[PDB]
Each structure stands twice: as C-alpha cells, then as structure tokens.
C-alpha cells in the first residue's frame, strides 16, 4: 500500500505546515502538524478543558472503532517551552488513503497557552523514532512504524513548499518531484532523532569550508539554527545586518538582496536561495526583517528546520539501519 497527502503553510510567513488526518469510524478529519522532531500523535478532544479550546476536536465516544488503553498516560514539552498531557485511545487512522488499525491516539486533557492561541493546528503527528514517545508505562509506536508492514517500501518523503502547498508521501519515491539524484547519509538514533553530520558550508559565491556540523532534520521547527562562527560568517556578507539583543537574533533591512547558503550532504550540495532566509518583517510595515539563519548556542544542538528542508526533496529511510536522503528540486 501507499498514501499521498497535501501539506499547507498555516500563515504568510511559513511558520508551520498542516496536513489532514482521518481518525475513527465514521472518519473525523483534523489538521495536524507533522513533526520529524518528536514521536507522539496527540489531538484536541472532547476531554480538553473547555477554557483552553478556541480548533476541530476528536470525540472518541462517536467512533465505533475507539478503545481506551487502560492505565496509560502521556506528558510532553517542546524546545519553545510549549506543552500538553492526557490519556490514550487506540483507533483507525488514515493519511492520504493509507489506513493503519490500532494506532495510539493521545487525547489532550490540557494544552499550553501557545496551542490555545493558534486556531489552525488541531494537534501533532510525530515521525521521529518510537524511543522518544512519552506514553507510560509502555511507550507507543508512531504512525510510520505501524504502517511499515503494509507499505510498498519502508520510507516516507517530505516536499515542503516556499509560500506554497507541498506533499507528504508514504511507501514510494516520486521520481518526477526532484532534479538530479538523491544522496544518502548515515543516521545516529542514540538521542531518538533523525541525527546526521553535514560535511560543511559556503556563503553565497564564496569557498566551501570542510567542517563537521552535527544536527537533526526537524519539520516541526521554523528556522535554520547553526554554530555561532558559521552564522557570523553568513551575516558578515549582509551590510545592514546586526545582532539585536531585544528582538532576540540577527535583523537586517527588508530591501536587502540576501546571499544563498549552501550545506554539504557527503560530496553533494543543497543550495538555499537567499529569499528563503528572509523570514519577514518584525511587524507589518516595518523597515527591518528577521533572519531565517540564527545561532544554535542557546539550544545546544544544530537544527535543520523548515528554512533548510523546503529547499530539498527529503527521504526518511526507515529500514532497520535508517538513512537520510537529499535531492535538489
């Protein structure tokens, strides 16, 4: 079997992407944020505290296939300080025509303020390794892990758009969606992430520096977070750019024409166009814009978020030894 679903930006800044998901019998359609940096499928629900709901909800008592997982609870927090917690059902879940039976669906009892404030996101669908799942006492498998037995190949692909719709595919590689060939690189699962080592970088039309950059592929993070010395080398080539203590990163004039940024995948090279690194104005009508490349020093790990991933066709190979592939598009 295979599945194919359309993914859409939530707003004009590409802050996040949403994908439809069918839960239960008859199907209830919710728009979820597909997150390769976490491993929980959780939703707004009929159980969520009413003052914390502003979203489409899942009602397990209206699904003939829902089963309560007795004794099970969950609790998660993310890199931005947001959080949620609750209890656990198993139910039928479909994505783009691909159906899984017995999937764990984590029903929120409570959500943090940033989730209440965002009307467009009905929950998250995690696609990292199942060792990061937060259900206790026994951790639960991701949607991808449960689908592998039926899939035509144990793979999914991410094709995110720049201010445009894109696609998540399960079980096949669409050879018409990229240019050139896919280059694969080794993955470490020691911390539970799609963790890999880039071979180096170049700024604009300058020289490629061979320097190892350990980081994670995270569709749930908006920006590209890299070492302080690498980020300083990029913004040195933008004449109005400065670090702003009060805004919380590099800012620059909206009228600048920005250089591209290239990262290494083995011997291959992925080029991020300069326009992708203009995140947008600090407020509507401002002369100053926020940068899409920022220092990772406050996180402690480098993060290849949407600014980087939307420049490529990305293959998440979930064979017993996993690998990560990148192609230009």
């Amino acid at each position: 079997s295979t599945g194919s679903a359309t993914t859409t930006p939530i707003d004009s800044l590409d802050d996040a992407y949403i994908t439809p998901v069918q839960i239960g019998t008859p199907a209830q359609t919710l728009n979820l944020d597909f997150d390769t940096g976490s491993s929980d499928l959780w939703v707004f629900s009929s159980e969520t505290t009413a003052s914390e709901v502003x979203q489409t909800i899942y009602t397990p008592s209206k699904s003939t296939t829902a089963k309560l997982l007795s004794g099970a609870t969950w609790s998660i927090s993310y890199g931005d300080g947001s959080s949620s917690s609750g209890d656990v059902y198993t139910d039928t879940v479909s994505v783009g025509g691909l159906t899984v039976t017995g999937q764990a669906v984590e029903s929120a009892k409570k959500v943090s303020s940033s989730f209440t404030e965002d009307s467009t996101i009905d929950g998250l669908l995690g696609l990292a390794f199942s060792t990061l799942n937060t259900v206790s006492p026994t951790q639960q498998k991701t949607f991808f892990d449960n689908a592998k037995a039926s899939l035509d190949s144990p793979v999914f692909t991410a094709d995110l758009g720049y201010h445009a719709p894109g696609t998540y595919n399960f079980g096949f590689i669409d050879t018409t969606a990229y240019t050139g060939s896919i280059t694969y690189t080794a993955v470490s699962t020691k911390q539970g992430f799609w963790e890999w080592t880039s071979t180096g970088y170049a700024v604009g039309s300058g020289t490629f520096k061979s320097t190892s950059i350990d980081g994670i592929a995270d569709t749930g993070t908006t920006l590209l977070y890299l070492p302080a010395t690498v980020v300083s080398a990029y913004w040195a080539q933008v004449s109005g750019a400065k670090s702003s203590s009060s805004v919380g990163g590099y800012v620059f004039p909206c009228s600048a024409t920005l250089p591209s940024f290239t990262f290494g995948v083995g011997s291959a090279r992925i080029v991020i166009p300069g326009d992708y690194i203009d995140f947008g104005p600090i407020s509507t009508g401002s002369s100053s814009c926020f940068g899409g490349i920022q220092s990772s020093a406050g996180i402690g790990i480098n993060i290849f978020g949407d600014v980087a991933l939307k420049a490529a066709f990305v293959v998440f190979n979930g064979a017993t030894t996993p690998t990560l592939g990148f192609a230009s598009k």
Binding site: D33, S38, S39, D80, S82, G192, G220, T221
Partner: peptide
C-alpha cells in the same frame, strides 16, 4: 516561530 521534543 515553532521549535517542535525537550
């Protein structure tokens, strides 16, 4: 901006 686990 979002920063999806800690």
């Amino acid at each position: 901006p979002t920063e999806x686990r800690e």
